[PDB]
Amino acid sequence: MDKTVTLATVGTTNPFSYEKKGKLTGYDIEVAKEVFKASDKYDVKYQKTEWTSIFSGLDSDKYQIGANNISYTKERANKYLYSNPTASNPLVLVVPKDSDIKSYNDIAGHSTQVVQGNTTVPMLQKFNKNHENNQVKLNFTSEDLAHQIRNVSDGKYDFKIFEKISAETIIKEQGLDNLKVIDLPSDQKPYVYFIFAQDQKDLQKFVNKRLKKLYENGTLEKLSKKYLGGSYLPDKKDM
Ligand SMILES: [Cl-]
Ligand SMILES: [Cl-]
Ligand SMILES: [Cl-]
Ligand SMILES: [Cl-]
Ligand SMILES: [Cl-]
Numbered sequence: 001m002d003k004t005v006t007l008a009t010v011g012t013t014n015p016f017s018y019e020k021k022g023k024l025t026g027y028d029i030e031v032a033k034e035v036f037k038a039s040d041k042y043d044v045k046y047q048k049t050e051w052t053s054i055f056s057g058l059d060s061d062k063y064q065i066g067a068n069n070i071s072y073t074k075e076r077a078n079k080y081l082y083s084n085p086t087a088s089n090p091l092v093l094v095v096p097k098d099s100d101i102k103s104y105n106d107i108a109g110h111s112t113q114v115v116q117g118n119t120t121v122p123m124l125q126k127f128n129k130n131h132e133n134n135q136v137k138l139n140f141t142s143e144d145l146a147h148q149i150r151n152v153s154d155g156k157y158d159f160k161i162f163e164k165i166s167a168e169t170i171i172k173e174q175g176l177d178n179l180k181v182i183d184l185p186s187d188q189k190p191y192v193y194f195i196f197a198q199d200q201k202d203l204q205k206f207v208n209k210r211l212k213k214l215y216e217n218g219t220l221e222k223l224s225k226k227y228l229g230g231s232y233l234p235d236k237k238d239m
Contacts, residue, residue: 008063028067085191085234110158
């Protein structure tokens with residue numbers, strides 16, 4: 001029978017990866033489904049799992065693909081293969097409207113929630129090394145992004161840093177009308193990607209060939225508009 005490929009996701013990051021009526025959908029998922037439509041070789045299983053388990057399962061080859069609004073880092077690239085980028089998604093600071101927090105450095109001394117292993121953690125840890133007398137209070141949580149965004153709306157925490165597309169989507173869909181988003185600097189292009197277990201070179205090649213085809217023929221843009229709510233593709237030369 002066809003080779004079973006398991007794609008691992010968290011499924012709590014609307015609109016990249018989430019459930020509708022119990023079924024997994026969102027840009028990462030629907031892109032993967034479109035990629036794999038044109039294969040006789042691979043049958044994909046889409047599996048919801050814990051964030052940390054995506055990575056440990058890729059390490060053990062329990063899983064072959066990871067997808068959940070995943071950024072490039074050198075630490076991850078040391079262990080996993082990356083696809084070509086699938087979207088560009090810059091960071092924002094989510095704060096109550098009219099907060100004192102107006103620019104990145106204003107977070108100094110304020111409290112936020114973070115989830116271990118996400119890229120904002122080392123970002124904020126670096127910030128604290130630079131502002132050691134007025135550090136951000138980091139509260140590690142196991143709760144999901146919408147939960148954390150609502151906690152800022154309710155005043156339990158002062159701000160949340162996350163990608164714009166999910167921040168905006170959640171604030172709109174959950175009617176959190178007392179929040180706003182502030183654009184933050186990007187150190188590098190803020191791309192997101194599929195990742196793969198390190199031994200899955202042929203799979204990576206297949207996915208990349210498909211992404212180039214889908215980019216060129218307009219399908220990827222169609223999916224970005226449909227699931228992300230706008231045209232957020234990476235730059236052509238980066239494909
Ligand atoms: Cl669920
Ligand atoms: Cl088939
Ligand atoms: Cl099939
Ligand atoms: Cl919740
Ligand atoms: Cl405040």
